């Protein structure tokens, strides 16, 4: 007849609320760490969210489902492509499993370091803390008993002009200058 | 309980899902050897790699191409339904080494003769099967002729 | 936007393939493994049933094939079918006449191809 | 032929001999049971697919320790095969 | 390996694999009963089958 699955088991979430209540909606905002830009999700993004790839023709229900059965219920037959795609899906699983295994082996042998990132990265990035042990990172220890005061970020939107509407404030504000084009 | 969760404790590592967002031909050959070791050929490809330090050393160099996402191995054991008591070590110990493009071998000739050797092993399997049969039959005929004459 | 923020967890959605597929019974405890381990090892299409047999529609790997000439193995097996002089073809390691130009630094070029890369060739051909 | 969702029951069957090959026979029995009821309803008399699946069913019984069940079933297979037009040469072989 | 391409008869036809395992099982049984001529008859048959193939 007709088939609809988002899943391997055919299961799903309770697509409709109980009568008279409020619905749960998907977050409309694009998923981005910074709060400010605030973009809505793209068509593409919605396609990723709904469990396809970015395209209608891969990874979704629009792949995994047969195009046709026979009328009496006999199912269709295996393409070279269909088989190849199954091998792809298994290639992802083998990838995941193998990777995980490598991590577990490495940790078992104690090769998982306690210092985040590598040496190349640590020397690039002043975010990761100096992991120095028995000394204080910055000089000798601070005594136990605010940069914003003296540092000014004030972006001046409009540039203040010279007062031609006053005769004296015109001459007093004089900038003595000769403009020079580089040579 | 405002206290430290009493354990036996387990340590759980991570897994990098890496997706390549730019054409590798735009970039120098170093960045391409890195993108290769991350197993990423073209724009649009996606891979899963371990979180061990070498891999991070790689991702660090290509970070202006690749976009990355992390899963701790619990989250991963969930992402595919895997019973919690089954680790990944045994799951990996089960699956066949013969899985596609099995190895990393140094040159395309060596790759050729690796596949070649694979086939040859098949032939020798069926041949050795037949020969085993002939050996056993030879034995039955010898014990039969020896027990019949005697 | 071509800059798309979303976990790349979706670029590889696993909803269709859980471990149930590669390990068929993992909800029991037994870790049997059925993997289709390449695209190479595909056997071919096979009918589900006697009732709906596979249609015969050809590809270029069939629809274009010539008639069989007897090779050396066939005439060894059964000399009855060596009936004429055209069967007597020589060692199979004879390819044919030389069909092209061996052009220095470019391959074997084709006759009526590009002579753009023949300079060294033409000059080689006339002869501490 | 009467409609049966053969895709899902086939699915169910392949899961069945995954169970069998994996060494747990009772479950393969249950699964084959379902699939056999389905095919039994879906195909006419003595059709190849019927005798195939009840061969498998016989094999599942045998492994569980229901022996006379296996016996009876495999004899049904045979006297079915005889009554067929032109049976699969692989099926008579598998059967016996 | 395009020259050396090989396909095991135990796959591309299931019939031969079935009869093979058939005779294997059979021969085992004969070795337990203590029947020699049976065992030899059956092994020889199995061989002839394999090299027919």
């Amino acid at each position: 007849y007709s088939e609809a699955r988002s899943n391997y088991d055919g299961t799903s979430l309770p697509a409709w609320p109980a009568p008279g209540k409020k619905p749960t909606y998907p977050a409309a905002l694009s998923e981005l760490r910074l709060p400010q830009p605030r973009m809505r999700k793209t068509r593409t993004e919605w396609m990723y969210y709904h469990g396809h790839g970015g395209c209608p023709g891969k990874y979704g229900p629009s792949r995994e489902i047969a195009d046709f059965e026979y009328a009496d219920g006999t199912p269709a037959s295996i393409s070279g492509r269909r088989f190849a795609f199954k091998h792809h899906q298994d290639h992802l699983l083998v990838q995941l499993i193998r990777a995980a295994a490598t991590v577990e082996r490495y940790d078992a042998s104690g090769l998982l370091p306690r210092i985040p990132g590598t040496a190349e990265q640590r020397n690039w990035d002043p975010a990761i803390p100096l992991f120095l042990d028995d000394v204080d990172e910055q000089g000798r220890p601070a005594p136990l008993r605010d940069p914003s005061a003296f540092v000014s970020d004030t972006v001046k939107l409009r540039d203040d002009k010279r007062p031609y509407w006053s005769r004296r404030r015109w001459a007093l504000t004089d900038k003595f200058l000769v403009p020079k084009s580089p040579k | 309980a405002a206290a430290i969760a009493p354990g036996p404790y387990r340590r759980v590592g991570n897994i990098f899902i890496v997706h390549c967002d730019d054409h590798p031909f735009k970039h120098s050959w170093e960045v391409n050897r890195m993108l290769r070791e991350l197993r990423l050929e073209f724009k649009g490809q996606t891979t899963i790699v371990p979180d061990i330090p070498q891999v991070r050393k790689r991702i660090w160099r290509v970070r202006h191409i690749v976009k990355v996402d992390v899963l701790d191995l619990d989250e991963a054991k969930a992402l595919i339904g895997v019973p919690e008591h089954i680790s990944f070590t045994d799951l990996a110990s089960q699956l066949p080494p013969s899985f596609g493009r099995v190895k990393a071998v140094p040159s395309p000739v060596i790759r050729s003769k690796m596949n070649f050797m694979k086939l040859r092993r098949m032939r020798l399997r069926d041949v050795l099967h037949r020969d085993a049969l002939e050996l056993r039959l030879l034995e039955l005929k010898r014990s039969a002729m020896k027990n019949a004459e005697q | 936007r071509y800059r798309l923020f979303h976990p790349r967890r979706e670029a590889i959605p696993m909803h269709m393939c859980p471990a149930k597929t590669i390990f068929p019974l993992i909800n029991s405890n037994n870790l049997l493994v059925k993997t289709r381990n390449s695209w190479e090892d595909f056997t071919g299409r096979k009918e589900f049933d006697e009732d709906h047999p596979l249609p015969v529609v050809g590809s270029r790997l069939n629809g274009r094939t010539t008639q069989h000439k007897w090779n050396h193995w066939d005439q060894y097996l059964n000399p009855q079918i060596t009936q004429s002089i055209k069967d007597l073809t020589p060692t199979p390691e004879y390819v044919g006449m030389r069909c092209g130009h061996n052009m220095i630094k470019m391959g074997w070029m084709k006759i009526g191809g590009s002579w753009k890369y023949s300079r060294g060739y033409n000059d080689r051909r006339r002869v501490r | 032929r009467p409609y049966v969702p053969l895709g899902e029951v086939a699915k169910l069957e392949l899961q069945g001999d995954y169970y069998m090959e994996g060494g747990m026979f009772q479950e393969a029995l249950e699964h084959y049971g379902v699939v056999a009821k389905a095919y039994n309803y879906a195909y006419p008399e003595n059709h190849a697919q019927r005798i195939g699946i009840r061969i498998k069913l016989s094999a599942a019984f045998r492994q569980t320790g229901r022996l006379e069940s296996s016996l009876a079933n495999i004899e049904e297979v045979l006297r079915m095969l005889d009554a067929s037009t032109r049976p699969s040469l692989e099926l008579i072989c598998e059967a016996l | 390996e395009e020259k050396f391409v090989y396909f095991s008869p135990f796959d591309y036809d299931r019939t031969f694999a079935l009869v093979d395992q058939c005779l294997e099982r059979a021969e085992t049984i004969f070795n337990e009963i203590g029947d020699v001529e049976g065992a030899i008859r059956v092994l020889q048959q199995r061989k002839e089958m394999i090299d027919k193939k």
Partner: peptide, 29 residues
């Protein structure tokens, strides 16, 4: 170059993929 087959790869078309018929018992027997 060498292939990693990292993306999805359609298989090749090769002769062993021919659809082989099921040998049948003769009609009379």
């Amino acid at each position: 170059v060498t292939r990693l087959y990292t993306s999805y790869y359609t298989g090749v078309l090769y002769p062993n993929q021919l659809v082989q018929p099921k040998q049948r018992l003769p009609a009379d027997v």
